Design a protein around this ligand. Sequence first.
Ligand SMILES: CCN(/C=C/N(C)C)C(=O)CNCc1cc(C(=O)O)ccn1
Ligand SMILES: [Mn+2]
Length: 306
Amino acid sequence: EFVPPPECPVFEPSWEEFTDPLSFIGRIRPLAEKTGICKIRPPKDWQPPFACEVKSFRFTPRVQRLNELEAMTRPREAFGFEQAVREYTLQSFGEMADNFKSDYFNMPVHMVPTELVEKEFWRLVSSIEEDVIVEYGADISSKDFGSGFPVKDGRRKILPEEEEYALSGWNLNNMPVLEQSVLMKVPWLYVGMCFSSFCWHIEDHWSYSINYLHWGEPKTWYGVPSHAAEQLEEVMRELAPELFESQPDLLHQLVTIMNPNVLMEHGVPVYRTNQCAGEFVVTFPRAYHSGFNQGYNFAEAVNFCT
Ligand SMILES: CCN(/C=C/N(C)C)C(=O)CNCc1cc(C(=O)O)ccn1
Ligand SMILES: [Mn+2]
């Protein structure tokens, strides 16, 4: 079955090192740049409150058919109308997500080993006999219902115990986002359920990205260092569906799902991590990454510049 890639680096900075994100990322770069991704665990006392407007938080998630590329191998009757379209609140999405996972594995959602969800995910992606369909609240703009981090503005109220987090350099709203040049830049939200996923991609302009899991079950990641970017792209073209082979990268990476073991078999280095609630994941410039969610969770991401 699936062989898990080696673990990416995890850093546990002291309060002194936790002072400036860009200074810290600059210092860990000699190691983290060689794995493409790294995980950062903040000091134990660093616990930002969740600041989204939860009562009015409503969204229509995207439908994900795990084996859609494998099923390209007579089209189905009335294709394009498989799943009925559902709108959710945070609470009703969570109820759906937990019922899906507990029903799927026949055990309570917190008892399912992360290694089993991983093994099953990659089996389902390549399975022609079983068609599993899930939903992902992905790419929700933080301008919609606010950031998960507290921010200083007239939108909501900030308590004194909250203000340190509104002002923190690790608040994703306070990251630098303006690239220097001769002359949408806000965080985005992701409401996950078991098996919801993001396929292999790099960021626009080869940007760094930083990713925070506010709460919930882990987000499983795979990363490739930037020195292997060209090798991954060559493996993709060789093994991607012929109909998509000529597509430009920006469109191709909407459907570049590929088992990490296939890349490893072709000599591409791949690292993994389970990002748990309260942890950051940083992706380095031109570091390909992909992943999936273990269950109901809430993440926030932003592209930043150095
Ligand atoms: C900074 C967030 N962003 C910008 C998206 N807009 C184009 C809508 C990205 O493209 C980030 N890349 C997608 C992604 C999504 C996930 C996820 O679904 O958790 C993890 C890692 N990377
Ligand atoms: Mn990304």
